[PDB]
Design a protein around this ligand. Structure first.
Ligand SMILES: [Mg+2]
Ligand SMILES: [Zn+2]
Ligand SMILES: [Zn+2]
Ligand SMILES: [Zn+2]
Ligand SMILES: [Zn+2]
Lengths: 83, 65, 45, 335, 262, 232, 203, 112, 54, 439
């Protein structure tokens, strides 16, 4: 039932699955004409643009980590420490 | 079958050596190596052609068309 | 009609339709179709 | 079993697989007929409107072309019989199905497939003939041999599953298997037998051949190292020219029985800053051992440069082996 | 200065000579050009009219494709793609034909000499079947019995050996260098001794052993080549060597012309 | 070339009102012009397989050649001594540089706003030789004369490459010249575009023209089958 | 003006330098290079009347107006692909859109089922040598099979003396050991007679 | 089936050239020349003459894949000298040696 | 349970005893043909409208 | 075989008897009917294309007719009569009155509906044209009320096959039905994907094909026709493969076929002496030179002829790809078989591997869009598929529970719908609920 921010006791590191689905969904949105928040260096492939947004944490998403008891947490990808 | 043209390696023409070969075998009764030495073959790549040939066209011609 | 050839005696029949399948002069029912009269191009490679 | 857990699916190809040392570790050579038969639905975006337009204007007969178009209304127009109409202009929001070009990751599999390594993604390289070409550093997790063995190739049809398939399934991302905490892929067959003869003390290579060996490296910096012997005649040792294929910043040491700092029997192994000091490269160094070189580079320089390590080592050792020469006669069994 | 050629054996088929003062690249390039980059005339298209033989049609077309032909004045015969006509013309190809029919009870043999030239040559000397048999009979193409006909028309076109192996005028090329092993290019394998197992080559007569107890060799280069060229029957050996040298010279000159335009 | 056109039709009474309206809108007087167009269809005596060398279906299309001709060959005897303006329409060795064009079927799409059509064009400067006539040239290419029509009208020059063609069309035959637009004038509003932004901007210009002319003359979209010059 | 095209079959890629050095005593000035293309097509119709050519020639002149002349049965056809060569009478009346294209593209895309591209000759990197009243242009012909031959273009504005000039050119061709060549200088418009010299010189 | 045509091994394709001069940034005064429709026969013969010169610091060649008739020739000469001139001297030397080989071969053939 | 071996017996006992399935098992989500809680699908992806203005 | 109509035949062009022959072959008619060819073989690690039982074959030897074989495919068709009223007839179908006609070309057929021998045919080509009479009031499907006449039922050639029709014959069978047999021949040139074996258990496909100038050569001038990987020998411990090569070389030099009987007194030292008497190395080695650089190899190569055989396994009868094809009638899934244009099977172990990798989206896509995806409507009260959906006017019902408002839409595979419908036919209720009532 939405655990508050002071009680979030999950791993602050972004896993490979979270990075994978964030890059996949973000790249899918970029392929569907989504507003890009980072200036492009001449890229054409959507996955490279998604990784470019992840490298600067400009992806506007938040992860709803489901807990085994039915609860969940909201860890934004901007505050998640990548790698 | 029916005398392979050229050779399967060097490339020298051998088809014109069969008739003489048999002619040297059935007339002079020489051995296979001696006849192959008279035809002019100096490499075994050619020798396997005449030596290991199985002429089956003779058994094919005995059928009426 | 189309030209046909007998199995054994290899005679030119050239029988038409509604004539069943049987050689004339002999009773061999195997009738050949004969090869086409047009040229066929091949490559030596 | 035949309709829920498993099923016969589309977007796949099965044929005989064969080796090709000139390819990379993660790639796979796909025949042109398979590339023209299978397809992939791409979404029309302003970044590739000109490229997809070229694919439409090329036709399904040519390889750089397309097969079907899908308008935004959810309707498919076939490129065949569409040339009778005349012109087909693409808009934003359509999905044009193109052929399998290069840099397209597809799943590669071999039955019965009892490992999670037996199904791994690969980068498509379009090559002629009809056999799947691949590097021999991947035949060990597949448990395969080039004697009539057929394999299966599945193609993803979505960008999300392609990215998720590329970030989770990859040959560099599967070098060190979690089965026995040791690398499952290594140098096998003639390359392993040739790298040993290359790493011998009696192995010396002349300049004219060393230049070609250093140029056969794809990521060679272009700096010719100083030869091991200068005057009379410049000579390069096998460990020197082979150390170029190993990336810099790698330290490794392995001592066995009778191994000393001098090592008269040339045992053990020592590498400092990507340069082989002593030790003969064999199964216990570059092979699928626990404390091997691939396990050190994989955890030191990551899986990317380690993926380049297979290519560099195979190119150098194979290029030295085709000129060196090796055989096996009856005198080897004569006592 | 440059290379020197000393012919040792000169015959109608095999010619062995010594090509020296040549860096290994020019000798290997020479033999590679002589094996590959030399034009030849061979049958490219076979049109079969009637065939009652027990052999397959494309099999007979293959055997006819392997038959060699004369190819002297082939320099002034343009290629098929170079001529602007449709199909062929008296500028690109030579038309041949074969008609064989079994007569008596004994089987009739179809020879390559049975081919006749029905196309104009415009003063050329190509299209003649090369006859190298001591009995005066051509290549035995196929055998036929009484009641079987064989009529076909072949189109002999120009091509090199890179298109097909049937355009191969040269045969086994004996390449050798350094008889007495002094350049240290081969480490001979021996069970007891290398001098008692490995026999001596013929070219060893034209040099001398390097003598034991002498200083090691490391400053000597590879030279003094032994090259034996063998022609099948199309063109003589001098046209093989000369046409090969002119071929490599036209290739290098083509690269120089390709660099001048940049 | 992608031409975006919107057509219309008026009568013989509102010609002065439309000329005055478009004159007050465009701010420029109309320009009298004419053009002759000859259509060459494939020769029925010749039969060719409708397929390219790459085993691809080919659709036969007609070829239209258009040119210009001064009004000295159009004005007869009862038309002399008249002002050379827009009020005339109410009273109705080698070869010349022809204009070779092939028009394709317009693009599909229901509820479309414009009528985009792909037309290929090459300029025939001149010719020479024995059979130097343009008819013998078309016969050499494999086409024969089918029909021809001469159109005379007025055109305007607004902005963004818009053309308003208020023209009448006649069929030039030997038995007589029949007026196809008998009873009114044919209106046209096309722009020639050599990008998606420029195409949509052209559609915006045409929609602004239809919105500005809404209430007076209506500019609808013609049927595709009415602009298909393929031979069936 | 007068023109004459001489084609040398038995030629080498270095023959242009030999002939260029032969005329060094008469070269006055060198102009900008030129380029020309020569496409040979074949009719694909299966029903043609008696006595008719089965090929259609196309000569594309570069920087000569970017033009293309089609020749068939001793007939010519001057076409262009540049928008600047279109007369204003064709644009003012609406008969021309303003963006033309090459006729070979239409013959190879729209009319490819009737005329197929058989032979292709690309001639680039030319030399424009101006002599004493004669403008000789040198170019080498390259086709898909490699080197083709030598092409000689003679253009002179003087309508009087012209046989002595081409005779001298053939003399210099005889001094460089360039035997066996075709000399074309017939007629049917200067570009049509020139293109006809190209056809009669390359066939 | 899918194997390319044989005549493609020596015929130049459409829209391509014989040499592709591409500057290289791995070392100062270095250039990579791409050779089309050729193999080791030309690459080794050119590389040898490039190694016989004293103005060339580095010179190598390689065939990237045997299914494509092409090979790369990496040349690196000293400062103030162009590798194209060294390639021209190499071609002239090869043409001269082949000409002397033909003249000497015919002269020795006229004595048999 | 029915997927492994004895399908009909398990199904019959299930329908007889009015059994209920939670449908978060692997094979269950496979049979129904939609996303399962494994790896990438073991978490939902959301959007924060307050982060779009960043 | 010239007067027979056997199905799937393979006759080699140049059958050759081996060199190391066994006496028992004299009683097995092997020298009269051999099943292979002797090929010059070298055992070396050349360009790395020989590893893992891979072989490099000479291209110039292939072009001269090495291991080239003929394949004869026989297509047998027969017309039949059900109740005498319906009679199948061999004829050329016209494209005007014949329904259900295949898209193949019918220009190669004659007036009797057959292809005369000698006509070059390719895939998707009809060889035997047969039509079946139909009734107007029996089906009337599509345009059957306009064609009126007959229905096509011809037997075309295989999709991937091509060749030249060798022989065609027509004959009445036992009950007097006129059937026709066809035989098409096709030369299958050895390709890279073709498999080859020997007489010692050594089997493997071709790795790559090189030309003479690209193949190593000895000082005499003999080019190997096939090179194999040394690493085959020690593991497999087949020493006879080397003894057959040595004795085959001695037999090729002396001109007498060597006796290769099992239990005799022939030793290896005697064959080494007999080979030493001919001038070559007694151990089979021979100095080879590189093909690319022309430089001598440091290690001598085991070089000599060896008898090889070509197996039935070829790549041209194995490679196949499917992208959206025909589905089965039962499960509406991709069919099984290469001739029916079938797709590969994504079995249970593959799905378990996809679970091991943790990719659920690729599993869902592979088990839905890549195979079969069905859309159905279920009811809110009862989770069964009784919701009648007439959505041409946007109307829904569920019979037996009084609902016309709450109707849910779900996407399940067609096989799962078959399972649910079979459970409903088996008196089992697979009720589906989109909401969690247990919580
Ligand atoms: Mg196996
Ligand atoms: Zn031989
Ligand atoms: Zn009879
Ligand atoms: Zn010709
Ligand atoms: Zn209900």
């Amino acid at each position: 039932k939405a655990i508050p921010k002071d009680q979030r006791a999950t791993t602050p590191y972004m896993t490979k699955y979270e990075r994978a689905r964030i890059l996949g969904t973000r790249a899918l949105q970029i392929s569907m004409n989504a507003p890009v928040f980072v200036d492009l260096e001449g890229e054409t492939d959507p996955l490279r643009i998604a990784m470019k947004e992840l490298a600067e944490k400009k992806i506007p998403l938040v992860i709803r980590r489901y807990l085994p008891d039915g609860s969940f947490e909201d860890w934004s990808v901007e505050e998640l420490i990548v790698d | 079958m029916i005398v392979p043209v050229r050779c399967f390696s060097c490339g020298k023409v051998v088809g014109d050596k069969w008739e003489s070969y048999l002619n040297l075998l059935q007339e002079d009764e020489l051995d296979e190596g001696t006849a192959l030495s008279r035809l002019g073959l100096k490499r075994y790549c050619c020798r396997r052609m005449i030596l290991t040939h199985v002429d089956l066209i003779e058994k094919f011609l005995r059928y009426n068309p | 009609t189309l030209k046909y050839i007998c199995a054994e005696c290899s005679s030119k029949l050239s029988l038409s339709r509604t004539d069943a399948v049987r050689c004339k002069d002999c009773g061999h029912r195997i009738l050949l179709k004969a090869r086409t009269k047009r040229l066929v191009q091949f490559e030596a490679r | 079993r035949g309709n829920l857990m498993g099923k016969r699916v589309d977007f796949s190809a099965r044929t005989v697989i064969s080796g090709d040392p000139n390819l990379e570790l993660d790639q796979v050579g796909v025949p042109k007929s398979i590339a023209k038969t299978l397809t992939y639905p791409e979404v029309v975006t302003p970044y590739n409107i000109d490229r997809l337009t070229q694919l439409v204007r090329n036709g399904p007969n040519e390889h750089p072309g397309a097969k079907y178009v899908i308008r935004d209304s959810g309707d498919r127009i076939d490129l065949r019989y569409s040339k009778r109409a005349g012109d087909i202009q693409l808009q934003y929001g359509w999905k044009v199905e193109r052929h399998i070009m290069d840099n397209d990751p597809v799943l590669f599999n071999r039955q019965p497939s009892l490992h999670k390594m037996s199904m791994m993604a690969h980068r498509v390289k379009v090559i002629p003939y009809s056999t799947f070409r691949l590097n021999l550093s991947v035949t060990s997790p597949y448990n395969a041999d080039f004697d009539g063995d057929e394999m299966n190739l599945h193609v993803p049809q979505s960008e999300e599953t392609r990215a998720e398939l590329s970030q989770l399934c990859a040959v560099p991302l599967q070098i060190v298997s979690p089965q026995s905490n040791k690398p499952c892929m290594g140098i096998v067959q003639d390359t392993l037998c040739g790298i040993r003869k290359l790493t011998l003390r009696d192995t010396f290579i002349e300049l004219d051949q060393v230049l070609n060996m250093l140029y056969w490296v794809p990521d060679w910096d272009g700096v010719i190292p100083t030869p091991a012997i200068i005057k009379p005649k410049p000579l390069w040792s096998g460990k020197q020219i082979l150390s170029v294929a190993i990336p810099n910043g790698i330290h490794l040491q392995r001592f066995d029985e009778g191994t000393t700092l001098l090592s008269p029997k040339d045992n053990g192994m020592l590498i400092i800053d990507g340069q082989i000091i002593f030790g003969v490269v064999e199964k216990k160094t570059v092979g699928s051992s626990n404390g091997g070189l691939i396990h050190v580079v994989t955890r030191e320089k990551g899986p990317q440069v380690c993926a380049k390590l297979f290519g560099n080592i195979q190119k150098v050792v194979n290029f030295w082996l085709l000129h060196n020469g090796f055989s096996t006669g009856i005198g080897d069994t004569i006592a | 200065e440059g290379p020197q050629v000393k012919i040792r054996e000169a015959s109608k088929d095999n010619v062995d000579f010594i090509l020296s003062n040549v860096d290994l690249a020019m000798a290997n390039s020479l033999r590679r050009v002589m094996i590959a980059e030399i034009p030849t005339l061979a049958i490219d298209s076979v049109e079969v009219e009637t065939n009652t033989t027990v052999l397959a049609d494309e099999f007979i077309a293959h055997r006819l494709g392997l038959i060699p032909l004369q190819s002297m004045d082939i320099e002034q015969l343009e290629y098929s793609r170079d001529c602007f006509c449709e199909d062929h013309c008296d500028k690109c190809s030579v038309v041949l034909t074969l008609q064989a029919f079994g007569e008596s009870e004994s089987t009739t043999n179809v020879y390559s000499k049975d081919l006749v030239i029905v196309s104009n040559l415009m003063g050329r000397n190509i299209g003649h079947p090369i006859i190298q048999d001591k009995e005066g009979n051509g290549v035995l193409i196929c055998k036929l019995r009484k009641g079987q006909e064989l009529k076909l028309t072949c189109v002999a076109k120009k091509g090199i050996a890179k298109e097909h192996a049937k355009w191969g005028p040269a045969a086994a090329i004996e390449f050798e260098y350094d008889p007495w092993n002094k350049l240290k290019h081969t480490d001979y394998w021996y069970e007891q001794d290398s001098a008692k197992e490995w026999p001596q080559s013929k070219n060893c007569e034209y040099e001398d052993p390097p003598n034991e107890g002498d200083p090691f060799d490391y400053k000597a280069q590879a030279d003094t080549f032994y090259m034996n060229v063998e022609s099948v029957g199309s063109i003589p050996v001098d046209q093989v060597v000369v046409r090969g040298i002119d071929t490599l010279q036209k290739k290098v000159a083509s690269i120089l012309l390709a660099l001048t335009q940049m | 070339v992608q031409q975006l056109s919107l057509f219309g039709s008026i009568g013989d009474d509102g010609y002065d009102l439309l000329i005055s309206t478009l004159t007050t809108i465009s701010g420029n007087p109309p320009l009298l012009y004419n053009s002759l167009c000859t259509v060459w269809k494939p020769n029925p005596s010749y039969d060719v397989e409708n397929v390219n060398s790459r085993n691809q279906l080919v659709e036969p299309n007609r070829i239209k050649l258009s040119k210009e001709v001064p009004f000295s060959y159009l004005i007869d005897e009862t038309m002399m001594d008249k002002p050379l303006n827009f009020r005339i329409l109410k009273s109705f060795e080698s070869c010349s540089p022809w204009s070779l064009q092939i028009s394709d079927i317009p693009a599909a799409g229901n509820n479309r706003s414009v009528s985009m059509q792909t037309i290929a064009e090459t300029i025939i400067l001149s010719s020479a030789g024995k059979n130097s006539s343009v008819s013998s040239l078309m016969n050499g290419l494999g086409y024969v004369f089918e029909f021809q029509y001469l159109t005379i009208g007025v055109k305007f020059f607004m902005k963004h490459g818009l053309i308003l063609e208020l023209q009448k069309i006649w069929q030039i035959e030997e038995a007589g010249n029949s007026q196809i637009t008998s009873g009114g004038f044919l209106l046209k509003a096309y722009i020639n575009v050599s990008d998606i932004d420029r195409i949509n901007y052209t559609e915006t210009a045409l929609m602004n023209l239809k919105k500005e002319l809404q209430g007076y003359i209506e500019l609808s979209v013609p049927d595709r089958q009415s602009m298909d010059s393929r031979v069936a | 003006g007068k023109s004459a095209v001489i084609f040398v079959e038995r030629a080498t890629p270095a023959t242009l330098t030999e002939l260029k050095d032969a005329l060094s005593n008469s070269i006055l000035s060198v102009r900008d290079p030129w380029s020309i293309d020569f496409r040979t097509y074949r009719c694909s119709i299966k029903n043609l009347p008696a006595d008719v050519s089965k090929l259609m020639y196309s000569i594309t002149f570069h920087h000569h107006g970017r033009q293309t002349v089609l020749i068939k049965d001793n007939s010519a056809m001057v076409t262009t692909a540049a928008a600047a060569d279109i007369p204003p009478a064709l644009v003012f009346n609406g008969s021309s859109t303003g963006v033309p294209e090459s006729i070979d593209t239409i013959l190879s895309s729209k009319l490819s089922n009737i005329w197929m591209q058989r032979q292709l000759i690309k001639g680039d990197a030319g030399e424009t040598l101006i002599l004493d009243g004669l403008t000789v242009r040198l170019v080498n012909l390259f086709s898909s099979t490699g080197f083709k031959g030598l092409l000689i273009e003679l253009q002179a504005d003087e309508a009087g003396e012209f046989e002595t000039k081409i005779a001298g050119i053939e003399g210099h061709l005889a001094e460089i050991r360039a035997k066996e060549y075709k000399t074309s200088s017939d007629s049917l418009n200067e570009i049509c007679d020139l293109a006809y010299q190209y056809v009669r010189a390359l066939e | 089936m899918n194997a390319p045509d044989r005549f493609e091994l020596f015929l130049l394709g459409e829209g391509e050239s014989k040499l592709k001069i591409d500057p290289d940034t791995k070392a100062p005064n270095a250039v990579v020349i791409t050779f089309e429709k050729e193999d080791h026969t030309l690459g080794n013969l050119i590389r040898a003459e490039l190694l016989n010169d004293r103005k060339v610091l580095f010179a190598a060649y390689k065939v990237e894949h045997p299914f494509f008739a092409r090979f790369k020739l990496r040349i690196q000469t000293t400062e103030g000298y162009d590798p194209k001139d060294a390639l021209k001297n190499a071609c002239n030397s090869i043409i001269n040696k082949l000409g002397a080989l033909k003249t000497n071969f015919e002269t020795e053939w006229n004595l048999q | 349970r029915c997927s492994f071996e004895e399908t009909v017996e398990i199904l019959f006992e299930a329908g007889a005893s009015a059994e209920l399935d939670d449908c978060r098992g692997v094979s269950e989500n496979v049979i129904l043909g939609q996303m399962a809680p494994i790896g990438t699908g073991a978490f939902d992806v959301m959007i924060d409208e307050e982060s779009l203005v960043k | 075989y010239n007067v027979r109509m056997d199905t799937m035949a393979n006759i080699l062009y140049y059958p050759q008897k081996p060199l190391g022959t066994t006496r028992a072959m004299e009683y097995l008619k092997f020298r009269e009917l051999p099943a292979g060819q002797n090929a010059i073989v070298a055992i070396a690690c050349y360009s790395g294309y020989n590893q893992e039982d891979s072989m490099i074959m000479n291209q110039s030897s292939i072009d001269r007719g090495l291991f080239r074989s003929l394949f004869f495919r026989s297509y047998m068709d027969q017309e039949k009569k059900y109740g005498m009223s319906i009679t199948e007839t061999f004829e050329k179908p016209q494209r005007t009155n014949t329904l259900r006609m295949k898209h193949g070309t019918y220009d190669k057929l004659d007036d009797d509906g057959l292809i005369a021998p000698g006509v070059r045919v390719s895939g998707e080509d009809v060889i035997i044209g047969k039509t079946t009479p139909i009734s107007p009031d029996e089906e009337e499907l599509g345009q059957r009320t306009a064609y009126h006449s007959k229905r096509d039922a011809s037997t075309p050639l295989r999709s991937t096959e091509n060749g030249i029709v060798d022989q065609v014959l027509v004959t009445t069978n036992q009950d007097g039905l006129k059937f026709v047999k066809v035989r098409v021949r096709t030369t299958k040139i050895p390709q890279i994907g073709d498999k080859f074996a020997s007489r010692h258990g050594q089997k493997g496909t071709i790795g790559i094909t090189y030309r003479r100038e690209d193949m190593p050569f000895t000082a005499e001038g003999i080019v190997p026709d096939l090179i194999i990987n040394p690493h085959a020998i020690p593991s497999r411990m087949t020493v006879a493969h080397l003894i057959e090569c040595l004795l085959s070389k001695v037999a090729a030099l002396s001109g007498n076929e060597g006796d290769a009987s099992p239990f005799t007194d022939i030793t290896v030292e005697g064959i080494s002496k007999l080979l030493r008497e001919h001038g070559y190395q007694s151990r089979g080695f021979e100095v080879m030179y590189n093909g690319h650089t022309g430089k001598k190899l440091m290690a001598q190569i085991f070089f000599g002829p060896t008898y090889y055989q070509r197996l039935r396994h070829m790549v041209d009868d194995k490679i196949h790809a499917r992208a959206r094809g025909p589905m089965q009638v039962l499960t509406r899934q991709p069919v099984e078989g290469r001739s029916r244009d079938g797709g590969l099977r994504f079995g249970e172990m593959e799905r378990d591997c996809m679970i091991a990798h943790g990719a659920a989206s690729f599993l869902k896509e592979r088990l839905m869009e890549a195979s079969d995806a069905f859309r159905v409507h279920i009811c809110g009260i009862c989770g069964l598929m009784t919701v009648i959906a007439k959505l041409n006017h946007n109307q829904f019902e569920c019979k037996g529970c009084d609902n016309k408002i709450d109707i849910y839409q779900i996407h399940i595979p067609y096989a799962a719908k078959l399972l649910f419908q079979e459970l409903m036919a088996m008196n089992i209720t697979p009720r589906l609920y989109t909401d969690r009532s247990r919580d």
